[PDB]
Amino acid sequence: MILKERQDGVLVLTLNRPEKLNAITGELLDALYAALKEGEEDREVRALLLTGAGRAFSAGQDLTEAHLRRYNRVVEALSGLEKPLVVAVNGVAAGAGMSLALWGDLRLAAVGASFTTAFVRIGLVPNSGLSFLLPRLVGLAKAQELLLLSPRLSAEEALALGLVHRVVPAEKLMEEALSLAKELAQGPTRAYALTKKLLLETYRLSLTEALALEAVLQGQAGQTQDHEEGVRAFREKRPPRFQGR
Amino acid sequence: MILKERQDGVLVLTLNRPEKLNAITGELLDALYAALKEGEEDREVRALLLTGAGRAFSAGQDLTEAHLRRYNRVVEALSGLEKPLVVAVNGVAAGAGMSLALWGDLRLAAVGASFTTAFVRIGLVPNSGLSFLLPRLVGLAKAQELLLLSPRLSAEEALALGLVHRVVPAEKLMEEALSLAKELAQGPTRAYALTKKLLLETYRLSLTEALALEAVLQGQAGQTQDHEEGVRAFREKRPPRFQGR
Amino acid sequence: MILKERQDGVLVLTLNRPEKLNAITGELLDALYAALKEGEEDREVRALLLTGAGRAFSAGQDLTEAHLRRYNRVVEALSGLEKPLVVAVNGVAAGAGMSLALWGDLRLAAVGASFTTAFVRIGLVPNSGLSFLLPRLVGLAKAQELLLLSPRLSAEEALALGLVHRVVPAEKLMEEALSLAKELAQGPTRAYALTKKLLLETYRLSLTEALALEAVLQGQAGQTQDHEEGVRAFREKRPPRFQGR
Ligand SMILES: CC(C)(COP(=O)(O)OP(=O)(O)OC[C@H]1O[C@@H](n2cnc3c(N)ncnc32)[C@H](O)[C@@H]1OP(=O)(O)O)[C@@H](O)C(=O)NCCC(=O)NCCSC(=O)CC1=CCC=CCO1
Numbered sequence: 086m087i088l089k090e091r092q093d094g095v096l097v098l099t100l101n102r103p104e105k106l107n108a109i110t111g112e113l114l115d116a117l118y119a120a121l122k123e124g125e126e127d128r129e130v131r132a133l134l135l136t137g138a139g140r141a142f143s144a145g146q147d148l149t150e151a152h153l154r155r156y157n158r159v160v161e162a163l164s165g166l167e168k169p170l171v172v173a174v175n176g177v178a179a180g181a182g183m184s185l186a187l188w189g190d191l192r193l194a195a196v197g198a199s200f201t202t203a204f205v206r207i208g209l210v211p212n213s214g215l216s217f218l219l220p221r222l223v224g225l226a227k228a229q230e231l232l233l234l235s236p237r238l239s240a241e242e243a244l245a246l247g248l249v250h251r252v253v254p255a256e257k258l259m260e261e262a263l264s265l266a267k268e269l270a271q272g273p274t275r276a277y278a279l280t281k282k283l284l285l286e287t288y289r290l291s292l293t294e295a296l297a298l299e300a301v302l303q304g305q306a307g308q309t310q311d312h313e314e315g316v317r318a319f320r321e322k323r324p325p326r327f328q329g330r
Numbered sequence: 331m332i333l334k335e336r337q338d339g340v341l342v343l344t345l346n347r348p349e350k351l352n353a354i355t356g357e358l359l360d361a362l363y364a365a366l367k368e369g370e371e372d373r374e375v376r377a378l379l380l381t382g383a384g385r386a387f388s389a390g391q392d393l394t395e396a397h398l399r400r401y402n403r404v405v406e407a408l409s410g411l412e413k414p415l416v417v418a419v420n421g422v423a424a425g426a427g428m429s430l431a432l433w434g435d436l437r438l439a440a441v442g443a444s445f446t447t448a449f450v451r452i453g454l455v456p457n458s459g460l461s462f463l464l465p466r467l468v469g470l471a472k473a474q475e476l477l478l479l480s481p482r483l484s485a486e487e488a489l490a491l492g493l494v495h496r497v498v499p500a501e502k503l504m505e506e507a508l509s510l511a512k513e514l515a516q517g518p519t520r521a522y523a524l525t526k527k528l529l530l531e532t533y534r535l536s537l538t539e540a541l542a543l544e545a546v547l548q549g550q551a552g553q554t555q556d557h558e559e560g561v562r563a564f565r566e567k568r569p570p571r572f573q574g575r
Numbered sequence: 576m577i578l579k580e581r582q583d584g585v586l587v588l589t590l591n592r593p594e595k596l597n598a599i600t601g602e603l604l605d606a607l608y609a610a611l612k613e614g615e616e617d618r619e620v621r622a623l624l625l626t627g628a629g630r631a632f633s634a635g636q637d638l639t640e641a642h643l644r645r646y647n648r649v650v651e652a653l654s655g656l657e658k659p660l661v662v663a664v665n666g667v668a669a670g671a672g673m674s675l676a677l678w679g680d681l682r683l684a685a686v687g688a689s690f691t692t693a694f695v696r697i698g699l700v701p702n703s704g705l706s707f708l709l710p711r712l713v714g715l716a717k718a719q720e721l722l723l724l725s726p727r728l729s730a731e732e733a734l735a736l737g738l739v740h741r742v743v744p745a746e747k748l749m750e751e752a753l754s755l756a757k758e759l760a761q762g763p764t765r766a767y768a769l770t771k772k773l774l775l776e777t778y779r780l781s782l783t784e785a786l787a788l789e790a791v792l793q794g795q796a797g798q799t800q801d802h803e804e805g806v807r808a809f810r811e812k813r814p815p816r817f818q819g820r
Pocket residue numbers: 104105106108143144145146147148149152153156177179180181182201203204206207209212548
């Protein structure tokens with residue numbers, strides 16, 4: 086239901102109900118939560134890559150039969166990952182499927198992938214963080230339209246809006262996604278984690294508080310081995326070798 | 331001063347001081363407030379459509395006319411509508427005229443319509459929610475330029491920035507706007523209303539609080555007839571028929 | 576280390592360690608703070624223009640040179656300037672160099688200028704307000720990519736993202752920047768200042784609080800000579816002449 090697989094410091098997670106377009110059930114949420122918590126705790130894992138099996142990323146909640154609490158746990162786990170997350174959207178992302186996709190720090194879609202909010206078509210509001218992420222990602226103007234009218238957006242339109250950072254031919258998506266994940270897995274994991282904490286908080290903070298948090302987290306980044314390594318690397322005009330500590 | 335008219339669940343409100351380009355006065359604000367309160371309370375109204383009479387949408391505050399509290403009341407009523415609002419910008423929107431236009435959830439402009447913040451040219455700051463809406467809609471970088479330099483944007487540029495969602499020839503604007511409003515008036519009114527409550531709050535909330543509010547409001551959407559209808563519709567591969575409750 | 580120079584109500588500040596690409600040291604920060612405080616207090620100054628000497632704007636923290644409180648003081652002073660700030664990016668802006676550049680209310684880059692977040696390359700998080708400004712300026716999607724991958728962006732890409740408002744040939748940059756600064760120096764300084772206070776706060780405020788602050792600050796703008804002048808100018812179809820009070 087969630088396939089796992091490690092590779093050069095990258096934990097690859099695959100949503101696996103392909104015949105139902107990876108539609109989301111309680112069980113899948115429970116398994117997804119577990120994989121994410123495992124990936125967080127495993128120190129050998131320095132990057133995650135999330136994708137779907139088959140033709141789709143995920144068509145969202147399975148409309149074949151508490152549940153809210155389950156989604157929320159996954160989102161707290163996705164958002165709080167102290168490790169870069171790459172998302173490879175290999176096909177349709179609808180409803181909470183789109184929500185999950187959008188939690189990637191770096192996001193790639195296949196030519197032929199698509200995105201639809203879908204919630205409103207079922208008389209529901211956006212969940213799994215979409216009301217949070219979407220206006221931040223594409224701006225309020227596009228958020229309003231995408232949410233209220235629920236159009237189906239193509240990969241190329243998703244790229245233009247900032248829903249994804251790169252579009253790639255289907256057969257190359259995993260190769261590029263994994264290649265990016267591997268590179269991130271070599272990079273300064275602590276700097277990544279703390280930069281993400283700043284981005285997650287930025288909009289609700291006053292400048293004063295933003296400056297204070299930057300100070301505190303810069304303080305911590307400053308005492309990592311990776312920063313020592315980083316400065317040394319720059320001085321001795323060579324690439325750094327980061328360990329994530 | 332504010333024309334009203336119902337049609338298939340849509341309340342159409344027209345700013346009507348056309349010879350003064352629908353420039354805004356205390357009286358017009360008072361009439362607008364009343365129409366909006368009525369529209370909110372009327373259960374047979376499932377969508378609103380706001381437009382201007384004549385050449386212009388609105389040239390903003392009438393410069394030939396405490397008072398700020400009056401604008402604010404109208405904005406609380408505009409923004410808090412528990413019903414999709416369509417805006418059809420039939421000509422120039424300047425100052426609080428632009429503020430009002432931008433409160434549409436879905437916004438259409440006529441080909442020769444135009445937008446100017448105007449405020450700074452009169453030595454004023456933005457009002458009527460523009461300092462709120464604009465940076466959210468188009469991002470801080472464009473907000474700074476639009477506000478501090480007050481250029482005049484065309485319909486096509488407004489479309490590119492997300493200030494409007496669709497551009498249409500003048501003579502077709504009302505037909506398309508009303509047609510959109512009628513379609514929204516058939517859709518899940520509660521889902522629309524609650525989505526808007528989430529969008530209004532999103533930027534000041536931490537992820538944790540955002541997830542909590544999504545849960546509460548999803549809880550309520552979940553107990554509407556429209557959601558039952560929504561799920562049933564998907565199962566029995568047919569279009570849903572929503573009532574807004 | 577910081578060159579100063581007045582001209583038609585514009586204070587021009589130049590970062591001057593050109594041989595080290597205007598890399599930032601404690602001393603430079605202290606000198607920059609002083610110049611900014613002076614510019615703030617001088618009533619004859621109605622605009623600032625910040626630039627770099629030589630090939631670069633600033634390559635960020637000098638890696639040859641807790642300390643965060645020093646940067647923060649400068650940022651509080653930059654952000655709280657009650658006067659439009661123009662920034663002319665004449666060459667590379669990296670790390671806190673990019674942070675400082677982005678505090679411009681209006682920003683110009685030379686053809687040939689470039690931008691790099693840089694922080695993550697040395698295993699650090701963004702500072703000097705970049706985690707605050709960047710997501711606001713270009714949206715969260717681009718912020719994620721710019722910060723985590725630290726690409727070097729060209730002037731034209733920076734323009735497309737909103738990092739700068741205008742790109743100009745190198746030999747004309749100062750002429751255009753100063754010309755813009757001079758125009759702003761003739762405009763309604765108080766309206767500028769108060770608009771900036773609204774923009775700085777907007778994201779963490781509820782609509783209700785945003786409307787209240789607009790009322791309070793509009794109240795103040797309303798009692799300036801410049802507003803009287805502004806209204807008078809519109810009535811007597813002529814350009815206003817503003818004094819900034
Ligand atoms: C765009 C998409 C996802 C894909 O369309 P196509 O590419 O055209 O494929 P298809 O629809 O033709 O069908 C593929 C098969 O998979 C099935 N399927 C495709 N989604 C589903 C599905 N969500 N369920 C069951 N079978 C499905 C579908 O029934 C089909 O089986 P069958 O036709 O053989 O019976 C399409 O099916 C669609 O528009 N909607 C379905 C997805 C959808 O609306 N999800 C929103 C659910 S709400 C949500 O995200 C979160 C949520 C959170 C919390 C609390 C409460 C409620 O909701």
